[PDB]
Design a protein around this ligand. Sequence first.
Ligand SMILES: *[C@@H]1O[C@H](CO)[C@@H](O)[C@H](O)[C@H]1NC(C)=O
Ligand SMILES: *[C@@H]1O[C@H](CO)[C@@H](O)[C@H](O)[C@H]1NC(C)=O
Ligand SMILES: *[C@@H]1O[C@H](CO)[C@@H](O)[C@H](O)[C@H]1NC(C)=O
Lengths: 509, 51
Amino acid sequence: ESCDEMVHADSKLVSCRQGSGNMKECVTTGRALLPAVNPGQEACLHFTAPGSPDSKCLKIKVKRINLKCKKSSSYFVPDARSRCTSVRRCRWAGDCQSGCPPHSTSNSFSDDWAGKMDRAGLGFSGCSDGCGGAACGCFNAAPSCIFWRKWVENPHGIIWKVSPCAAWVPSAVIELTMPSGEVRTFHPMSGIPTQVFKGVSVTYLGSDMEVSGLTDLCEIEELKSKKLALAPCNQAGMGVVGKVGEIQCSSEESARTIKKDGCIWNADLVGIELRVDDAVCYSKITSVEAVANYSAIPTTIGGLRFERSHDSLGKISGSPLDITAIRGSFSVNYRGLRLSLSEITATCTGEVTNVSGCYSCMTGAKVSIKLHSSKNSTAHVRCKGDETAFSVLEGVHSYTVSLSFDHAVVDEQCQLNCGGHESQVTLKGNLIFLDVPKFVDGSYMQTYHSSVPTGANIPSPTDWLNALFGNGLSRWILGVIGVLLGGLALFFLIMSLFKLGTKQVFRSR
Amino acid sequence: NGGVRLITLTSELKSATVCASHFCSSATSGKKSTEIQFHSGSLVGRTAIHV
Ligand SMILES: *[C@@H]1O[C@H](CO)[C@@H](O)[C@H](O)[C@H]1NC(C)=O
Ligand SMILES: *[C@@H]1O[C@H](CO)[C@@H](O)[C@H](O)[C@H]1NC(C)=O
Ligand SMILES: *[C@@H]1O[C@H](CO)[C@@H](O)[C@H](O)[C@H]1NC(C)=O
């Protein structure tokens, strides 16, 4: 589409050579600054070489500006169950004389338990006491050593992905297109590196907007059913029992099993109770839908409407009513890149075909320009009021670009130049005015709003009284006279009607 | 006249987001033919819908 907000910060800053024989470049290094633009615009970065007449540009595309948060930590908490078993034995020797553990023996495995498995998981080797007698299992009055072992299992295999965060910094998406032809996408943050690719390090800056009731919120998501929910989650490994933050593990691929060496649990997560050689275990682990302040995919806490934006590396978003933020400018840095220049530009001349659009408003006024040349793309339009750069193709084609005008009747003379050749163009058409749209029921904001032009807010006497009188440099007086005569005639008629009405009201009471 | 309409033939619509020139919206009901509107007179001119 169109382009605006040119910079030209580091023109004529090359130290190249003959360039592979005919014309090439080596590297370009500098620094520029891109101002804030509306969502759905393009910011071009036009370079200028001292030898070559013109060069290519670098377009920056922004689609949505969502309110996401950072990533403090990452972990997976699998679902657990209640499993336990016991065994009944007799003393019959000096191993269970008085107590089961002499001083520190915690290995409650008498070469018979099933703890040496890969599906067992985490547990605690405990022990208890028993009774004596024929009904208790022995034939000698003595405390019987009865061992018990409990653990947790996961029959289904549901895996959750929790990511605590307490920053909620503004962010947006950037669809960057390199001048060579490669087009890639990435999600920059507010002050966070954006994984610089081929030297380009374009970053986004915000305004540090405060939050109303966002203190302890997380972005726990589900993997199988892809279900999202907003609920306060736990912190890193050092945690407390009573809320979310149950038995975790290393990663997702290691979350299917609850085995040790990666799974972390502090203490007191499963209870044990026994009366007579039973050792039954009860469940105390709560599911995700058990703590307070558990929201769902649609969340309208406060002025923010947290929706589920389909996007990679993040599924949490939200957009209040029109905010009109202060500034959202960018910062671009270069380290190294290669670009080719033709420097073989020939005669090129274009003209204007159509013109339409709004007044100085959001979408602007789009003007169609037709060109004809042999070079692929060598053009740079420069005029007063606004500057717009675009790319063309080989041969004769049609292109549509948008410019910013500050006059109702656009009748001026701009200068157009493609590569090294220059010419003159003219624009003539009628435009209209569109203000900020109003809010309607059933519609909710999705990403954000940038800004709306509401500066003048005053009627212009030049554009006004246009269709009232008429056209013409001398027909205006005739139109004014005719309108005045008609107004006087209608005023006399209305006065006569009012006099007749008053006369009818006075008499015949 | 009111806005854009999304048509689904494979299955129902769970959730989707639409994009316009200078505005965006998001709505979901769970039917086949769902309607999504941005505002009153917000789309005036030549724009491209990216859902
Ligand atoms: C839920 O949110 C309310 C209001 O923010 C707060 O007072 C309450 O302590 C929260 N509950 C929990 C368990 O944190
Ligand atoms: C220019 O003429 C009209 C004016 O709006 C427009 O509809 C038409 O598509 C334009 N011509 C071409 C060839 O696109
Ligand atoms: C111009 O474009 C055509 C087709 O897109 C391509 O084959 C050709 O290599 C291009 N020329 C240059 C100098 O990039």
